[PDB]
Amino acid sequence: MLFTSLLLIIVYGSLVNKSHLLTKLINRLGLIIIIYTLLIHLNINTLENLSIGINMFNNLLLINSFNNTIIELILIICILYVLLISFNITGLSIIDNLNYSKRTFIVIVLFNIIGLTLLPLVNDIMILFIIIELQSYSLYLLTAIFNESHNSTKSALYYFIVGSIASFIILDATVSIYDDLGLTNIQYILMYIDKLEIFDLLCLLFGLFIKIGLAPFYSYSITIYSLSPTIITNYISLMPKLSILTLIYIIMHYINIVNNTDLNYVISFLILISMFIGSFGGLNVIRIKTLLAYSSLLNVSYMLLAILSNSNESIIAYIYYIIQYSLTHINIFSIILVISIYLPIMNNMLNVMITKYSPIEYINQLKNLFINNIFIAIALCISIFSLIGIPPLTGFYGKYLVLISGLNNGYVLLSIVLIIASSISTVYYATILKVLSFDTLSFKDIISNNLIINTSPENNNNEIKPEISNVISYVISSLTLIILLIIIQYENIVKGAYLVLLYNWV
Amino acid sequence: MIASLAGWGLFGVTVRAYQQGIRKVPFSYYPLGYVYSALGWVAFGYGFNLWTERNDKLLEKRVEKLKESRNLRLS
Amino acid sequence: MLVQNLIIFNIIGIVLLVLLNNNNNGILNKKSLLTIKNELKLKQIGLIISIINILIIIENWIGFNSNYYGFQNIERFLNIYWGIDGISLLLVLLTLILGPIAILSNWKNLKGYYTYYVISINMLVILMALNFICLDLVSFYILFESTLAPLFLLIGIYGANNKNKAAYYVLIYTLASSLFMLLSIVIYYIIINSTDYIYINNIILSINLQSLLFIGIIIGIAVKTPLMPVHTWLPTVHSESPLGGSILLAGVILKLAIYGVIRLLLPNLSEISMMFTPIIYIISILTLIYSSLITLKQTDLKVIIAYSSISHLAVCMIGIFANNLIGINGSLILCLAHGFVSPALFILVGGILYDRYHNRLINYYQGLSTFMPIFSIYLVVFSFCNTGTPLSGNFVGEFLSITGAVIRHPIIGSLTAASVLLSACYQMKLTNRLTGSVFSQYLHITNDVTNREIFLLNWLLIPTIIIGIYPSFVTNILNLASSTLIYSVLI
Amino acid sequence: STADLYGLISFTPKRDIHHYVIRVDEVPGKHFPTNTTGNFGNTVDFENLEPRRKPINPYL
Amino acid sequence: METYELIDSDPKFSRVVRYFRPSDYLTWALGTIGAPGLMVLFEKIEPAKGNTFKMPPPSIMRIATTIGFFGGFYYAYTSSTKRFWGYSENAKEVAKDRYEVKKALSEKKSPYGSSLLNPYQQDMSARNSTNSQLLLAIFPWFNVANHQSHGIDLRKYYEVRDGEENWNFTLPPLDQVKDLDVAQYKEYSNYP
Amino acid sequence: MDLILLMLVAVGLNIIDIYIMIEILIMGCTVNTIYSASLDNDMIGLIYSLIQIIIAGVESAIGLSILVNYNRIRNSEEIE
Ligand SMILES: CCCCCCCCCCCCCCCCCC(=O)OC[C@H](COP(=O)(O)OCCN)OC(=O)CCCCCCCCCCCCCCCCC
Ligand SMILES: CCCCCCCCCCCC(=O)OC[C@H](COP(=O)(O)OCC[N+](C)(C)C)OC(=O)CCCCCCCCCCC
Ligand SMILES: CCCCCCCCCCCC(=O)OC[C@H](COP(=O)(O)OCC[N+](C)(C)C)OC(=O)CCCCCCCCCCC
Ligand SMILES: CCCCCCCCCCCC(=O)OC[C@H](COP(=O)(O)OCC[N+](C)(C)C)OC(=O)CCCCCCCCCCC
């Protein structure tokens, strides 16, 4: 469905005239395409049938119940992201017209979704290289979709160069394995898992670690996420991690067969450093997206501990954590896009310049959100408390399940370090909440008619005009209540994660 | 099963009621929104209950094999 | 029935207050009718909700059997088992009684946003009350840390000048230390596959593993009582938090650490607790002695009371780690007696003087008895309760705690008697100054204690003296529950 | 029961170089695009192939 | 797991479409009109421009109908495929499958059909297309070849089941059926 | 000489010189694939080599367009 509908959309977009409305309606067609893709995928793929692992296309691909869950998660999160470009985020044309000015925005997303979903399924070194290029190229094209933006193009140049170096590392690792064994299929290579050099697969993981922004390669991702438009940063900071981490889990599942503890130590070294950088890095920053970039680096370190331990408790930890972290990531960026409407307008020191791509760029632009919109401010507080790991929010069970798998495998040091890392990173998570609310009483009775929202007109002065659009408000309401009230269904959700198997069987 | 679907619809009422606070409108604005929201989460709730009922059936079948596997180990 | 009704009713109460007070946010710019008299109706609804929560625990108290061994009212709700014993029942009632007091103490001394404050108070009370009725380690940790989210925002919004410092201190000291307690809980769930109270109480772990688990848990407990040297968060948090936040912090939040010893250490790590008791006694004794001498040099009224709380909770820690019934009962009674006297002293010091003069420096106040005689009576009466004068529940708690320490360790447990002298040194140095000499030249004569502040002081004093004269109201309930915690094999 | 159920699900049986799961269902090389009979080094008889290792489905 | 009888591990494209139930055609129509209908619903939920409802232009409804038409067929194709695989209830399809195979066997014709492909290409085609429906949501791939790798043993068609006595098919031995592997390599073992 | 990262001095001081290094580095992987495939008499390795060449040429074009548009952004006044 994805491939077939992409071709029609590519041709149709080039046929009709260029207008903001037509691009917005074409984006809604992309929303329908992903929904049909999800319905078709659900209709044919079921957890019980895929438990064994089924080969497709001359064994080039291999789908199992662990791969299938991530594919559905990718489709669901991609549905939520397209609502941002398919509906009004703020309702004001000066801000929202950006999401409708590029007709190839939806085409690139559909190109990348194909790469995202196929990557966890790779069963051959030749197709591993091809797909990892397909995913990477679409990310570069999305990072440069706004080609009239100096920062957006500069990020895409940085993204291309770093991601090409990682791809060469990935290709160099597969060529070394082919040279050793003369084989290309993963299952054939598994027959010689005891005789090939296992560190040839660590080189393969190193290229994958660059593409997820792990330390010491964290610098480029922190730079790129801060320079890119908030709508672009929302996608590129989350989507590559859903697929690559799932692929890393499958590769580490094969690596654990031979039980090379030297390889386990190198990865533990990268996790340890990433916890230190992820926590201490965000303490002295003023940009919200730079802060979230370190948050992403920290949460990836938590998941990689579950991936490194790689046991029955690790499947449950990784599966639950990746689902709840994606929803928290989506919820936070949705609020950040919305709350640009409460920005004061001049009518000056430090000569602060704010652009249309990233109206919310500094943490202190979130000031007085507790006064402007209490329900949204609480929704942002709930999400930030979830990242902190305050029970009984979703983020608590994520850290709890990660710790179980890590401590069960003897990773005493990394379990202690992450809990120290969690405490250190709480300092900059709390600073968001301090900005939102702590000045409520000393500012409650003030006259603020200089906001961006005040520039909007009024219809009749007898109607009730909602200040936030319908779709974006319902998504924020739904995700926030899921994060808050996960205790009700936590037992049933974790029983489902018990059934997701990766060649466990018996 | 009505009691379970009753709670899911009440969750959908809460979702809509929370949304009204986000948009800063009175909670009585467009009362049809609660009916729409309630049914949308009853539908999700009904599918959720089928998912959990399936999971318990699958878990029992897997547990039987796991117990046989554990009995061999405990010797 | 208890947990299910206590949660469902309060959610309806939380939603009701939000619906009424937020129905008019939408550029109405109106004047409403619930916003009059500092949101009087919204305050009154929240005040009623707090009292009704006390009625719910009573309905389950009427059926409580003091001659039954084990948890009662065993319930399943949200896939969690909830139960009550003699120890838990009294701590739940203490927690819920302070709910109305916290709301009424801040009845008219907030700059605004009364609905938010009332919800957070009722939200803090229920989460703390639910922490005494959970029956597994993970549920204990969930409720142990869930209070940080509302408490952090309560301090930062309604706090004093240094509220930003105090909000960070409470969030980071308590969250970082509790994560070490989470490590021990994760270990229990890994090797035993359950965190249920009864299940883990029967398992004996290796003496080396019991040491690691004890240290993880004791780190979380020691910070939250607090004990030296991890006590530095409390004086800063108490001086900046609102009056209701200080009442709940000084009345309930600190008592969760003693209940943590009762659940998470004594019945499951019994062998290693005996090994650690000398270390616990040394830390607690020095916590008692150091905090008393440090309290002498303090110059802030609300910080003096904060350091007074640390001295008495060191005595509670000493009693609960005695391996006899006398010490355990003494520590529990002292927890309840402190749960009334300490909030009362914050009302006198940070709720009456501060609401009139807005300054907590000791140098501004003296001779208050000349124009505030009613304030001086309550100040003097609660000062003697705070030093463990007989006829007060504090003395009964202190005497049995000291006696339990002497029975447990005759040599070093005798140092606990310094609580009698040292507590009177700093408490009667402050009271002798507020009621001494000529009425201060830096103060203008104003109103004495009002009816609301008389009401708060009377209903915190009354339980202290009833327990002090007839503690068997409490000891009868605790007798069978406390006897299960003792570990000894006499031959 | 809850403690027992978690013990079964969370137990991870050991994997080494002697027992692990390989998802190959049939032997390759029955047909080649050209020159299927090469140096006659293909000693596998596809007329009398022994039964393969069928994967285990735990839900069946 | 509620498994059923395996009919064809890699059903041919024509067989899948022919074995559509009336509900499969119904879902094909629902997909076709579900895409324009969702464009109306999205506008109803939140208008694209301004605050008033506006019907989307006819050109959008034209491309939407085409997208739904392909989506409706892919859903119906996967619905019918599960019956061949045995994942879904297929009692009707087994009876129809048995009649067609027994009819072709009695005529000494291949149940699979004659192929333009040589033995390698028939095997290669089955390798490419078998189980490809699991990714039909991502990109399409169909079995449009007459290969013999269908995961079934034709000896099971030589036992008469309940409700098949009135068919009176006299089945020859498998070595007389044209275009089958067991009746192809007569003179040389590497040439059919 | 390799472990002290002598290759960092051989790369020129323009953004395009980084592009050339990437092409040369990837070309080293393909030469290694061709060498192994020829020794083994394996056409699967040569199919891999052909795929690498086509894919490596795709990213060369995608990276060039980014650098082309980056230079256009600087020369943006275009009053002519
Ligand atoms: C400033 C705050 C304002 C409050 C200040 C004053 C506080 C109130 C003072 C009283 C405190 C409450 C304690 C008394 C409550 C009643 C206790 C009780 O239940 O007594 C029971 C007693 C024995 O029980 P039993 O044999 O089982 O028969 C009863 C069966 N239900 O049966 C009896 O024989 C009852 C005997 C009761 C005697 C009267 C008690 C009143 C206090 C006077 C004695 C106090 C102790 C003496 C201290 C003098 C100074 C050293
Ligand atoms: C302004 C408002 C502030 C907050 C107010 C809070 C109101 C709470 C309303 C609760 C309604 C109710 O009672 O829901 C209850 C119903 C019915 O439960 P059941 O099917 O019998 O399951 C039995 C429940 N056990 C296990 C406790 C016995 O389940 C629900 O709907 C679940 C709520 C959804 C939570 C999100 C997680 C599930 C989605 C999974 C996606 C990954
Ligand atoms: C089978 C079960 C589902 C059935 C219903 C689902 C589709 C509802 C569409 C009706 C039309 C409509 O939405 O109309 C638009 C309305 C009103 O919008 P407003 O913001 O008041 O604008 C003001 C309108 N004036 C100006 C006319 C007054 O929006 C709603 O009511 C929003 C409710 C959406 C419910 C979404 C449920 C999602 C569940 C997700 C689970 C994973
Ligand atoms: C027992 C479990 C309960 C869970 C539900 C929590 C309450 C939900 C409130 C949403 C509605 C809302 O944001 O409403 C806002 C309300 C009331 O504010 P107000 O004074 O009317 O606003 C001002 C409007 N004026 C200007 C018109 C007067 O604030 C509350 O309620 C605050 C309670 C939450 C604080 C703690 C947050 C901790 C997050 C993590 C928790 C683990």
Residue numbers in the entry:
A (entry chain N): 1 to 347, 365 to 523
B (entry chain d): 1 to 75
C (entry chain M): 1 to 491
D (entry chain h): 123 to 182
E (entry chain O): 1 to 192
F (entry chain K): 1 to 80
Quote the paper.
During analysis, it quickly became apparent that the sample was compositionally heterogeneous, with some particles lacking the FMN-containing flavoprotein subcomplex (NDUFV1 and NDUFV2, responsible for NADH oxidation) and some particles exhibiting an unexpected density that formed a bridge between the two major arms of the L-shaped enzyme. In contrast, the presence/absence of the flavoprotein appeared not to cause any other changes, so it is likely unstable and simply prone to dissociation during purification, reconstitution, and/or grid freezing. Accordingly, our structural analyses now reveal that Pp-CI exists in two distinct global states but with the unexpected twist that a hitherto-unknown protein is observed influencing their distribution: Being specifically bound to the closed state, it appears to stabilize it by forming a “bridge” between the two enzyme domains. Like many supernumerary subunits, NUQM appears to have a structure-stabilizing role in CI. Unusually, however, it bridges the hydrophilic and membrane arms and appears specific to the closed state. In summary, the results show that Pp-CI exhibits closed and open resting states that resemble the closed and open (active and deactive) resting states of the mammalian complex, respectively, and that NUQM binds to the closed state specifically. When NUQM is bound, the enzyme adopts the canonical closed resting state that has been observed in many structures of CI from both prokaryotes and eukaryotes, whereas when NUQM is absent, the enzyme adopts a more “open” resting state with an increased apparent angle between the hydrophilic and membrane domains.
Mitochondrial NADH [reduced form of NAD+ (nicotinamide adenine dinucleotide)]:ubiquinone oxidoreductase [complex I (CI)] is a large multisubunit enzyme located in the inner mitochondrial membrane where, together with the other electron transport chain complexes, it maintains the proton-motive force and the NADH/NAD+ redox balance that are required for adenosine 5′-triphosphate generation and a host of metabolic processes (1–3). The process catalyzed by CI comprises a redox reaction coupled to proton translocation across the inner mitochondrial membrane. In the hydrophilic domain, two electrons are passed from NADH to ubiquinone [typically ubiquinone-10 (Q10)] via a flavin mononucleotide (FMN) and an extended chain of iron-sulfur (FeS) clusters, forming ubiquinol, which is reoxidized to sustain the electron transport chain and reduce O2 to H2O. Here, we report the structure of isolated CI from the yeast Pichia pastoris (Pp-CI) and identify distinct closed and open states that resemble those of mammalian CI.
